[PDB]
Scaffold this active site. Structure first.
Site, PDB file in Angstrom:
ATOM      1  CG  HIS A 108      11.561  49.416 -12.501  1.00 12.27           C
ATOM      2  ND1 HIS A 108      11.843  48.458 -13.287  1.00 12.27           N
ATOM      3  CD2 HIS A 108      12.594  49.702 -12.595  1.00 12.27           C
ATOM      4  CE1 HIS A 108      13.171  48.951 -13.458  1.00 12.27           C
ATOM      5  NE2 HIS A 108      13.550  49.661 -12.684  1.00 12.27           N
TER       6      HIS A 108
ATOM      7  CB  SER B 222      20.124  46.302 -15.961  1.00 12.45           C
ATOM      8  OG  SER B 222      19.726  45.681 -14.952  1.00 12.45           O
TER       9      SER B 222
ATOM     10  CE1 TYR C  94      17.858  44.941 -18.875  1.00 16.59           C
ATOM     11  CE2 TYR C  94      17.357  44.881 -20.554  1.00 16.59           C
ATOM     12  CZ  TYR C  94      17.190  46.717 -20.267  1.00 16.59           C
ATOM     13  OH  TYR C  94      17.342  47.210 -19.917  1.00 16.59           O
TER      14      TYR C  94
HETATM   15  O1  LIG Z   1      28.744  46.710 -11.844  1.00 16.24           O
HETATM   16  C1  LIG Z   1      28.608  46.770 -12.531  1.00 16.24           C
HETATM   17  C2  LIG Z   1      27.876  46.703 -13.423  1.00 16.24           C
HETATM   18  C3  LIG Z   1      28.259  45.218 -14.039  1.00 16.24           C
HETATM   19  C4  LIG Z   1      28.301  44.333 -13.359  1.00 16.24           C
HETATM   20  C5  LIG Z   1      26.931  44.093 -13.570  1.00 16.24           C
HETATM   21  C6  LIG Z   1      25.627  44.643 -12.452  1.00 16.24           C
HETATM   22  N1  LIG Z   1      26.278  45.816 -12.785  1.00 16.24           N
HETATM   23  C7  LIG Z   1      25.586  47.367 -13.272  1.00 16.24           C
HETATM   24  O2  LIG Z   1      26.114  48.552 -13.242  1.00 16.24           O
HETATM   25  C8  LIG Z   1      24.054  46.842 -12.054  1.00 16.24           C
HETATM   26  O3  LIG Z   1      23.284  48.165 -12.507  1.00 16.24           O
HETATM   27  C9  LIG Z   1      22.006  48.397 -12.312  1.00 16.24           C
HETATM   28  C10 LIG Z   1      21.165  49.543 -12.965  1.00 16.24           C
HETATM   29  C11 LIG Z   1      20.330  49.530 -11.867  1.00 16.24           C
HETATM   30  C12 LIG Z   1      19.159  48.289 -12.123  1.00 16.24           C
HETATM   31  C13 LIG Z   1      20.525  47.345 -11.194  1.00 16.24           C
HETATM   32  C14 LIG Z   1      21.530  47.717 -12.383  1.00 16.24           C
HETATM   33  N2  LIG Z   1      28.993  48.595 -12.797  1.00 16.24           N
HETATM   34  C15 LIG Z   1      29.201  49.101 -14.172  1.00 16.24           C
HETATM   35  C16 LIG Z   1      29.881  50.790 -14.616  1.00 16.24           C
HETATM   36  C17 LIG Z   1      28.854  51.293 -13.039  1.00 16.24           C
HETATM   37  C18 LIG Z   1      28.827  52.192 -12.851  1.00 16.24           C
HETATM   38  C19 LIG Z   1      28.003  53.729 -11.772  1.00 16.24           C
HETATM   39  C20 LIG Z   1      28.816  52.526 -10.770  1.00 16.24           C
HETATM   40  C21 LIG Z   1      28.927  51.200 -10.795  1.00 16.24           C
HETATM   41  C22 LIG Z   1      29.449  50.842 -11.872  1.00 16.24           C
HETATM   42  C23 LIG Z   1      29.740  49.148 -12.009  1.00 16.24           C
END
Ligand SMILES: O=C([C@H]1CCCCN1C(=O)COc1ccccc1)N1CCc2ccccc2C1
Length: 627
Positions: free
Chosen positions: A341, A457, A455
């Site tokens: 990680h 992420s 939490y």
């Molecule tokens: O789809 C999302 C958000 C909101 C829904 C939960 C997962 N998301 C995550 O960011 C998941 O992030 C991680 C990161 C590391 C490990 C596990 C999960 N975005 C949030 C913003 C965003 C920014 C760039 C490209 C797409 C998106 C869509």
């Protein structure tokens, strides 16, 4: 050729022009901190915390914040959070197994016969090396989040944007509602490992190395997958070499060295120093610099639980946990990636995962009827050997003891809720992510009677050297809604329940958008704490508050992703009394994979999550609540 993609736009094209990660105003951070505390604290606890925040905001916090801003202005090439965040994981002394390393498992090849172990290990390995070559050549398409794919994700756009100078390219994407992501972590996918050192570990990369590391029954093998000209070794020769390894009849070593990568980092740091003193530097360098580690397990998967245990930790003998990632292939062709990680946020792993699944299934290197090349694998494959002192053998025995006792305390369960998913929830105008998070809050209240620190992420990779930010799903709205469903289920009308879920969804959407834009509170408060401790200041009283500790003791730790390549993912809880919750909302169904230690019960929690989802769906359909 050797490339799995031929991007018109150079891979790193947007990197020079990504926007800088914003630092919130301190006043906003303190309000957001307090909003997240409201459902967790009693009235007196909350008043004390509110008083501390007031003092922080006008006192030492205001000064730390000023220093943070000055530092960020001087360091405009990076983000304020990236350095401190790496430092946190590399300094941590805990075992990386369970505590930090997660896994994602591949869906099978839809062509059944292609799931033969040798066939699949060959195809996945070749696709992985094709990904390496594609990334290095800058032929991988840039990572870009499209809001309007029909306008932005086209050949017309690509042929234009490639000529736009690197310093302007992000703006071009922005104008079509596309958001390029940071890719600065991607290089650490390959030829990379974490080296245990006293006090703080280091990340090592050697982009010159050309060989693969293979683990089977605890034995280490290396062979070249790139030739002296940098071209991928003939896939039929790779198949031959893997067949050679699979044919080895040696039993598991008396002292399997891989156990050491599961130790406490200060313990492992010292034992590694002893290994070098005993002449093993050249062998260690071969392990450290390999393109990645391929693990060939000699048993099939009984079921999804056995799969999760195998990919999350295994039996301790057949994973090099320090490696950037371990690609694991079982006897029935079940495959997964277990990854370390500390080197990144996992977006690179997901991109890798997706491209490798697509390439290995749509354009496989070999078939199950492919005959391996006629080579002399004993000349091309080196079996590694470690010179082990008496001190090392005792260390391995101690490592095995610790590993076995800990791993035994872990339980895992999964569910596939088939009543509906994204399509239905979107028709009801709800965020599907908010609904999943509501269900976990509702299940915890029902089963344990509490609201606890939660939490989720979120990526801040839309920004230069962006990392992650915490979404805090436990809100006054989920608390209100959970209590409505749970305390007296017949109390509220379906119309009232629908209105409450709509409030949770709206607020969760707001928190998600804020987090993605760097406007959560968790990273900002962490950066202020880090700045204080780095300059040898006494910890400000805000951080000594039991409420701060409680907010960072994440009993419900959750993560999701959406990909046609991923069958399921998983990770252990981050605290002893916690759950590790991996979930995905698909078009027509919802999946969860939950872990727990002895103090909780993952399967029982999912009985409850199932009940809460049935309740939510019933109410949404206008049906009276029922048992
Ligand atoms: O789809 C999302 C958000 C909101 C829904 C939960 C997962 N998301 C995550 O960011 C998941 O992030 C991680 C990161 C590391 C490990 C596990 C999960 N975005 C949030 C913003 C965003 C920014 C760039 C490209 C797409 C998106 C869509």
């Amino acid at each position: 050729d050797d490339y799995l993609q031929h991007s018109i736009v150079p891979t790193m094209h947007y990197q020079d022009s990504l926007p800088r990660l914003p630092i919130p105003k301190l006043e906003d951070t303190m309000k957001r901190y307090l909003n997240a505390q409201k459902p967790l604290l009693d009235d007196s606890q909350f008043r004390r915390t509110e008083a501390l925040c007031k003092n922080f905001e006008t006192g030492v916090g205001k000064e730390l914040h000023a220093h943070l801003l000055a530092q960020d202005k001087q360091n405009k090439h990076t983000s304020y959070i990236s350095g401190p965040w790496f430092d946190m994981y590399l300094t941590a002394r805990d075992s990386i197994v369970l505590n930090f390393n997660p896994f994602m498992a591949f869906n099978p090849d839809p062509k059944s016969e292609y799931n033969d172990q040798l066939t699949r290990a060959t195809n996945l390995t070749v696709s992985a090396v094709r990904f390496l070559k594609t990334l290095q050549a800058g032929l991988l398409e840039p990572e870009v989040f499209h809001l309007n794919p029909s306008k932005s994700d086209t050949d017309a756009f690509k042929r234009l944007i490639r000529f736009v100078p690197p310093s302007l390219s992000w703006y071009g994407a922005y104008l079509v509602n596309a958001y390029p992501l940071d890719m600065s972590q991607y290089f650490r996918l390959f030829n990379s490992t974490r080296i245990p050192r006293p006090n703080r570990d280091e990340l090592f990369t050697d982009t010159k190395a050309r060989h693969l590391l293979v683990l089977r029954k605890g034995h280490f093998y290396v062979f070249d997958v790139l030739d002296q000209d940098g071209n991928i070794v003939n896939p039929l020769e790779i198949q031959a070499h893997l067949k050679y390894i699979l044919s080895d009849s040696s039993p598991v070593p008396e002292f399997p060295v891989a156990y050491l990568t599961s130790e406490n980092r200060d313990v492992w740091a010292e034992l590694r120093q002893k290994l070098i003193f005993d002449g093993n530097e050249e062998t260690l360098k071969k392990v450290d610099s390999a393109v990645f580690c391929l693990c060939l397990d000699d048993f099939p998967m009984k079921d999804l639980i056995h799969l999760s245990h195998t990919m999350l930790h295994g039996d301790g003998t057949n994973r090099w946990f320090d490696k950037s990632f371990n690609l694991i292939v079982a006897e029935d062709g079940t495959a997964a990636v277990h990854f370390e990680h500390s080197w990144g946020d996992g977006v690179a792993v997901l991109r890798f995962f997706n491209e490798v699944f697509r390439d290995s299934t749509q354009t496989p290197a070999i078939t199950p009827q492919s005959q391996p090349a006629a080579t002399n694998s004993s000349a091309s494959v080196e079996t590694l050997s470690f010179n082990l002192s008496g001190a090392l053998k005792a260390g391995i025995t101690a490592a095995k003891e610790k590993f076995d006792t800990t791993v035994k305390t872990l339980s895992i369960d999964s569910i596939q809720f088939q009543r509906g998913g994204k399509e239905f929830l979107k028709k009801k105008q709800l965020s599907p992510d908010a609904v999943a998070q509501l269900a976990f809050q509702m299940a915890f209240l029902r089963q344990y009677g509490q609201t606890v620190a939660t939490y989720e992420s979120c990526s801040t990779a839309a920004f230069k050297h962006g990392r992650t930010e915490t979404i805090r799903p436990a809100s006054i709205f989920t608390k209100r809604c959970s209590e409505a469903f749970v305390r007296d289920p017949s109390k509220h009308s379906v119309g009232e329940l629908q209105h409450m879920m709509a409030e949770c969804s709206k607020y969760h959407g707001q928190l998600t958008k804020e987090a993605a834009m760097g406007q959560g509170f968790d990273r900002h408060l962490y950066a202020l704490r880090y700045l204080a401790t780095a300059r040898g200041l006494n910890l400000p009283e805000l951080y000594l508050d039991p409420a701060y500790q409680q907010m960072n003791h994440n009993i419900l730790s959750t993560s999701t992703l959406n990909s046609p390549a991923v069958s399921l993912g998983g990770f252990a809880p981050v605290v002893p009394d916690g759950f590790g919750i991996a979930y995905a909302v698909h078009d027509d169904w919802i999946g969860c994979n939950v872990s727990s230690y002895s103090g909780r019960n993952a399967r029982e929690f999912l009985h409850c999550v199932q009940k809460c989802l049935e309740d939510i769906f019933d109410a949404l359909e206008g049906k009276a609540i029922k048992t």
